[PDB]
């Protein structure tokens, strides 16, 4: 029962992101088979996902979804293998998904993308070792930075200052950035960095995960605990006042931690790589995860 959406959604689930009203966004690539492409989905009902028949809207992208994020409420910002950043927007009825733009700007796979706190600008990171800043309104690249000497693993916009963002790379550099300096980047002193999360209540603090499964904690103004057996893929802070830290890894497991990085939850519900997490707005003990085993799982987290 799908309207202008596709017959079957690709097996490899990459992204899962609730919005304001408690609706679920799904990015999917097919990383094996005749046809190597990607798809986008809205589930007004989270519990029905990933049922193609029980979706609200869906669409096919030319190629693979490496990462996406929301852009307010009607907008989806996407990183194609094509080397493109794509901006799609929901129709008025919220029943179609439509390519607003798709500029081919990176010389390789776009691997990461974060929206800046303004909402009128975003920053993407690629395997071509180039970090670029986009104005979404004008659909152009304002600046392109080759700070790094290797593939750009992950980029995360400041939640508050709209000229600050983190970046990490195979070249083993974590970078704190300010667009307002003539030299906008700063290195921050082993194993490679793999995921980045800002603390939501400190302009000053953030967590990174390494290729070895150690989660680390830092404010530029080190505390750590080895959470995982394989590389940390992802780190999303809960919405609570004193908030919880969801971490997910290629070891097919999900942990939720407290402020001291002490482990309070575990799920080998997953049987392939865990690739995302996103907490509900309508519930803050509801954690949703997706992985390459095609399982949308809805965990209840004790607090």
């Amino acid at each position: 029962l799908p309207p202008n959406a596709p017959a079957c959604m690709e097996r490899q689930l990459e992204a899962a992101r609730y919005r304001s009203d408690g609706a679920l966004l799904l990015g999917a690539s097919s990383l094996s088979g005749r046809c190597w492409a990607g798809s986008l989905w809205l589930f007004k009902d989270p519990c029905a996902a990933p049922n193609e028949g029980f979706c609200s809207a869906g669409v096919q992208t030319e190629a693979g979804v490496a990462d996406l994020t929301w852009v307010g409420e009607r907008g989806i910002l996407v990183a194609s293998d094509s080397g493109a950043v794509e901006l799609w927007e929901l129709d008025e009825n919220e029943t179609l998904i439509v390519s607003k733009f798709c500029k081919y700007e990176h010389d390789d796979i776009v691997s990461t993308v974060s929206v800046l706190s303004s909402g009128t600008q975003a920053v993407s990171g690629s395997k071509d070792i180039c970090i670029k800043v986009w104005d979404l309104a004008q659909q152009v690249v304002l600046s392109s930075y080759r700070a790094h000497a290797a593939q750009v693993t992950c980029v995360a916009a400041s939640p508050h200052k709209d000229s600050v963002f983190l970046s990490c790379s195979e070249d083993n550099r974590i970078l704190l950035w300010d667009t307002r300096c003539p030299k906008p980047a700063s290195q921050i002193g082993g194993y490679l960095p793999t995921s980045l999360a800002w603390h939501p209540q400190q302009s000053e603090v953030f967590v990174f995960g390494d290729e070895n499964g150690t989660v680390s904690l830092v404010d530029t103004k080190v505390l750590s605990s080895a959470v995982h057996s394989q590389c940390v893929t992802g780190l999303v802070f809960s919405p609570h006042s004193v908030p919880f830290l969801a971490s997910l890894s290629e070891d097919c497991s999900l942990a939720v931690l407290d402020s001291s990085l002490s482990e309070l939850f575990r799920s080998q519900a997953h049987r392939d790589f865990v690739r995302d997490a996103t907490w509900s707005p309508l519930n803050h003990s509801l954690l949703t995860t997706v992985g390459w085993d095609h399982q949308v799982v809805h965990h209840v987290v004790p607090t």
Partner: protein
């Protein structure tokens, strides 16, 4: 006019994507064999039991296509030299898995990156693959002209780029490749796909890479400039390099996305095609040499081997040599004959090793143009060649004999000679035993006679060439010393090589040898200033000769006679390559040795480090008397 493929890291539909590329004018496609983000667990459950097909079916193209149109790319996540163990292992598996699929498909080549300094475990995995089953996929190492690190933007406040000139620190990507191919004992299946950035290094680096097995150049869209009309183009510095590469007949790979949007994407190719059209077309020598590029051959031995009819035929087609010989004889006749003696005095001229008579014709031509009188002899030990001479003699001469079949050392002349003319010269001048042959014949030269040629001198230069090193390696034969092939000269049109220092003279011979004893052996020590770091693989041999006064022939590259193809460079290999550091001197020693029956060369390297003496007692190589 130029072979070129397209690099992509994104192929949604292999069918349509290959077609688009073909529409653009390309000849092959470098693509991934597995999805570059599809990462695989070989050891830990549950991930190791990931169901379904690991990649797309081989049925998706003709075997023909797979064999011709596709180049495989190792997934970027595969990092066999990771500091993390688990990664290092999954990487070992993944790599073999990908290379094994590449073998299954009969891919013509496969791309692997050199993008850090330590590729030891990567070398080793590829060495096991190369020695596992039977397959002849080529291996193209993607190595950058400059490390991504050394052309990062200077935009880290607390980590600035070095404003100093580091000589080694901007040569660093060659040591990466060198170390990798050295570990793989120079496998002939491992070549260089050289990546070009926006900044080029100093020209010393650029000289370095030629002499390395570059099968592919990689041009990112990002380095291309725009012209008046808004089309993709390159700087004069980048073009000069492209011209240099076209000369090596490499393949060209356009990578990255379309930066000149309004102007289409087949336009980059057209600039390459345009550049190829507009370079100087090959000269006579170069047209003649096409095919013989870096092709090792045994140097001819006309003294103890009888040359073929067709071997003589090609040497006779040499324009400049016999024109020079004619001219030399003309001057000599004038210098020897005063005008008032024009018809009283007739010169006694003897061609020694007369072959099929090209020097005889030269003498006739000289006689007329100088308006002097000569009496001609033709001495020829090759009886098969004598048949040519005697037929022509019988048909067009009858003036006495003198096509006299004999060895010039053997022959008893009916009278002493004014002038003796010979073409006994080899690529290393004295290596066809011209000295020994003419010393034999010397007694029938008049006490004030002239020999053409009057004197010749050989020249050596140290060379770096990993291609030529392998070519010699592959001359290893059964039923002889395993390192015999390193202890003999090869005649070869050196192409893929680097000349580390200027040629200097080795051995010189004058005719006649007026003085007594007349020992023909020699020992000579030479020292070569080396401007770069490098690897010594052996020594080029060239020669020049004085036919008469200012009349010369020369294969010395700087003074090379124009369009003279009768000789090519000779090569003296060394068993083990000797590393050289910039500023060091290379010291080589060469001996000419002989006995009653044979003449040979021995040679050695004494600086910076010592080599084993090569060809001791002519055990691997001799020249028969």
């Amino acid at each position: 006019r130029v072979s070129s493929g397209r690099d992509l890291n994104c192929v949604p539909e292999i069918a349509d994507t290959l077609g688009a590329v073909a529409k653009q004018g390309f000849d092959f496609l470098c693509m991934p064999v597995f999805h570059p983000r599809f990462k695989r667990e070989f050891i830990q459950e549950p991930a190791k039991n990931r169901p379904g097909p690991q990649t797309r079916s081989d049925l998706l193209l003709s075997g023909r296509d797979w064999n011709t149109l596709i180049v495989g790319k190792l997934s970027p996540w595969i990092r066999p030299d990771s500091k993390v163990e688990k990664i290092r292992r999954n990487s070992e598996a993944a790599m073999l898995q990908e290379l094994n699929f590449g073998a299954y498909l009969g891919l013509p080549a496969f791309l692997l990156p050199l993008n850090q300094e330590d590729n030891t475990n990567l070398a080793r995995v590829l060495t096991n693959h190369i020695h596992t089953g039977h397959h002849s996929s080529m291996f193209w190492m993607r190595v950058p002209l400059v490390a991504p690190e050394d052309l990062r933007d200077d935009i880290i406040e607390n980590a600035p780029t070095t404003h100093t000139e580091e000589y080694s620190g901007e040569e660093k990507t060659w040591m990466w490749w060198h170390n990798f191919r050295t570990l793989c004992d120079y496998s002939k299946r491992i070549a260089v796909a050289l990546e070009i950035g926006a900044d080029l290094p100093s020209n010393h680096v650029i000289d370095r890479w030629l002499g390395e097995p570059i099968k592919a150049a990689i041009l990112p869209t990002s380095i291309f400039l725009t012209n008046k009309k808004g089309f993709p183009v390159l700087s004069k510095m980048h073009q000069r390099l492209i011209f240099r590469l076209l000369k090596l007949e490499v393949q060209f790979i356009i990578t990255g996305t379309n930066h000149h949007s309004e102007k289409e994407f087949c336009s980059y190719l057209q600039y390459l095609e345009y550049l190829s059209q507009n370079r100087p077309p090959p000269n006579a020598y170069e047209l003649f040499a096409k095919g013989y590029e870096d092709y090792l051959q045994s140097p001819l031995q006309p003294l103890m081997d009888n040359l073929e009819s067709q071997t003589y035929e090609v040497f006779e087609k040499d324009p400049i040599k016999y024109s020079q010989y004619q001219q030399a004889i003309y001057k000599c006749l004038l210098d020897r004959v005063p005008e008032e003696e024009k018809d009283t005095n007739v010169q006694v001229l003897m061609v020694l090793g007369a072959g099929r008579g090209p020097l005889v014709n030269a003498s006739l031509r000289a006689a007329k143009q100088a308006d002097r009188r000569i009496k001609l002899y033709a001495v020829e030990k090759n009886p098969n060649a004598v048949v040519t001479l005697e037929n022509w003699q019988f048909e067009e001469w009858g003036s006495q004999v003198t096509v006299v079949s004999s060895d010039m050392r053997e022959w008893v002349a009916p009278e002493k000679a004014d002038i003796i003319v010979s073409e006994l010269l080899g690529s290393f001048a004295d290596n066809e035993l011209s000295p020994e042959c003419l010393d034999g014949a010397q007694h029938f030269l008049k006490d004030d006679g002239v020999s053409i040629p009057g004197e010749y001198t050989s020249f050596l230069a140290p060379i770096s060439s990993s291609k030529l090193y392998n070519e010699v390696r592959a001359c290893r034969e059964k039923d002889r010393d395993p390192e015999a092939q390193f202890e003999m000269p090869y005649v070869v049109r050196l192409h893929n090589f680097h000349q580390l220092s200027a040629p200097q003279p080795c051995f010189t011979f004058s005719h006649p040898n007026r003085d007594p004893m007349i020992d023909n052996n020699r020992y000579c020590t030479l020292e070569f200033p080396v401007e770069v770091n490098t690897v010594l693989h052996g020594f080029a041999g060239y020669f020049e000769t004085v036919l008469y006064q200012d009349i010369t022939l020369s294969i010395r590259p700087e003074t090379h006679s124009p369009g003279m193809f009768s000789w090519f460079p000779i090569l003296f290999p060394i068993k083990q390559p000797i590393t050289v550091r910039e500023g060091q001197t290379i010291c080589v020693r060469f001996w000419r040795c002989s006995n009653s029956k044979k003449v040979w060369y021995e040679w050695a390297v004494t600086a910076p480090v010592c080599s084993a003496i090569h060809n001791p007692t002519g055990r691997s190589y001799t020249i028969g008397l």
